[PDB]
Every structure is written in structure tokens, then in C-alpha cells.
């Protein structure tokens, strides 16, 4: 952050910071590019497959930057222009998971993008760390998330839906209703066992029909459906919480 004996001095965490708003603002241009499109070709996986990744080699440099913690570099950090970014950020995984949860093509890249958020979280858990009640860092997350409200109540539904998906799937109703221990059930009887436990709505038990991999038996596996959905919560949602 400063060099203290020499004559001039370079802000590499004011200019690591300034690399993640460029990279955001690169991967929110592809987002906006591929809304309109219903489907992700190779190309364009591929290319938001290196930028994750170098998005999430930037947040582990930041946080390695402000661990410890390094009130200096935590400063420097708060009056930089991070929270630009993760307001983009938030936007991008607040579309993205909804756009990706549907298709059972990008599997690889939800992953992605969600160990991508997991990272961004921990970083912002770093910048909180060492705090002080009525702090400057945590005023300013506070701002940026009442910026971004509307994509964190988004990314919020979207964890509860897949949170309680755990839940309807440990209820005694599928252990009564399927005695087979392959787990292959019907995408009606599914449906049914949902308005049944009735703590989705009806346009969440319709997303969540979407969702699901549909078979040309309808023989979806809800194992390796929760398998999918509900782990990167609890991981991910927990950090947020």
C-alpha cells in the first residue's frame, strides 16, 4: 500500500481494485450481451470460464491484501472504488443464477460463478473483519447493499427456495411415498408432493419444476437434484448470513 523510504510511492491495492472494476465491467458487458439469448454457446462458456476465474483470482489477492487484519489496506479499500464492483457483481450472480438454474447445459458454469460469489463474500467478511460498532466499513456496506437491494433480495429468494428444498426432501412424505432407494419420481407425483408440503408458492414450485432435469421417462433424480442446488447453499448462504 505505501512505501515508506522510497521517493514515490504506487497504490498497488488502489490498482488490483481498479483491475476488478475493469474485469466486472467486461463480465457484466458478456451478461448483457447473452440475456436476450436463450442459450450459452461453447465460445461464450469458455470465455466466462477464464473470466471467473480471473475475477477469482483478484478477490483472493484483495482478501489476502486485507486479512490479518490490515486496517490500512481495509481503508484504502473502503474509500476505494470496490464497491462499484460488487454492486456489478451482485447484479451479474443475482441474472445469472436465475438464467443458468433453468438449462442443465451450464452446470460448470453456475458452479463457477457461484464459487466467483462464495469468494466476492469472503472478501467482504475480510473487509469486516477487526470491526468496530458504527464503523466507517460497515456503513459503507451498508450503502452498497441498499444500492444493489433489489439483487440481494433476488440472490435472498433464491437461497430460501433451494435452502428448504433440503427440508421437503428429509419430510416422511417422499420416505412413505417412493420405498425405493434409487430416488427416481415422477414430475407429477413431484409436483404433488410440493403443493403437499405447501411452503413453496406456486411460482416457485414452477421454477423449481424448471429447474429440474427433465427425462424422457420423467424419472428426475431429486438426489442429485438437492445434490446440485441445496450444497452450494449452505456454503454460500451461510456466508451471507
Same mark, same amino acid.
Request: overall charge negative; some cysteine; proline content about 1%.
Given at each position: ?7 514515490? /510511492? ?9 483491475? +476488478? ?39 483472493? /489477492?484483495?482478501? @489476502?491484501?486485507? #486479512? ?6 481495509? #481503508? ?33 458454469? +453456475? ?53 428448504? +428444498? ?35 408458492? #406456486?411460482?416457485? /414450485? ?16 431429486? @438426489? ?18
Amino acid at each position: 500500500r505505501t512505501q515508506t523510504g522510497n521517493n514515490t /510511492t504506487v497504490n498497488i491495492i488502489i490498482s488490483t481494485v481498479d483491475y +476488478l472494476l475493469r474485469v466486472q465491467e467486461s463480465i457484466s458487458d458478456f451478461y448483457w450481451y447473452y440475456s436476450g439469448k436463450d442459450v450459452i454457446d461453447e465460445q461464450g462458456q469458455r470465455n466466462f470460464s477464464k473470466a471467473i476465474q480471473v475475477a477469482k483470482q483478484v478477490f483472493n /489477492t484483495l482478501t @489476502e491484501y486485507i #486479512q490479518g487484519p490490515c486496517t490500512g489496506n481495509q #481503508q484504502s479499500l473502503a474509500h476505494s472504488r470496490l464497491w462499484d464492483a460488487v454492486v456489478g457483481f451482485l447484479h451479474v450472480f443475482a441474472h445469472m443464477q436465475m438464467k443458468l438454474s433453468q438449462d442443465s447445459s451450464q452446470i460448470e458454469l +453456475l458452479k463457477e460463478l457461484m464459487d466467483l460469489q462464495k469468494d466476492m463474500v469472503v472478501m467482504l467478511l475480510s473487509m469486516l473483519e477487526g470491526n468496530v460498532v458504527n464503523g466507517t466499513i460497515g456503513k459503507q456496506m451498508v450503502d452498497m447493499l441498499v444500492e444493489s437491494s433489489n439483487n440481494v433480495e433476488m440472490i435472498l429468494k433464491f437461497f430460501d427456495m433451494f435452502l428448504k +428444498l433440503k427440508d421437503l426432501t428429509s419430510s416422511d412424505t417422499f420416505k412413505e411415498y417412493d420405498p425405493d432407494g434409487k430416488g427416481v419420481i415422477s414430475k407429477r407425483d413431484f409436483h404433488k408432493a410440493m403443493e403437499s408440503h405447501k411452503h413453496y408458492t #406456486q411460482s416457485e /414450485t414452477e421454477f423449481l419444476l424448471s429447474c429440474a432435469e427433465t427425462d424422457e421417462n420423467e424419472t428426475l433424480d431429486y @438426489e442429485e437434484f438437492v445434490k446440485r442446488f441445496h450444497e452450494p447453499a449452505k456454503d454460500i448462504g451461510f456466508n451471507v448470513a
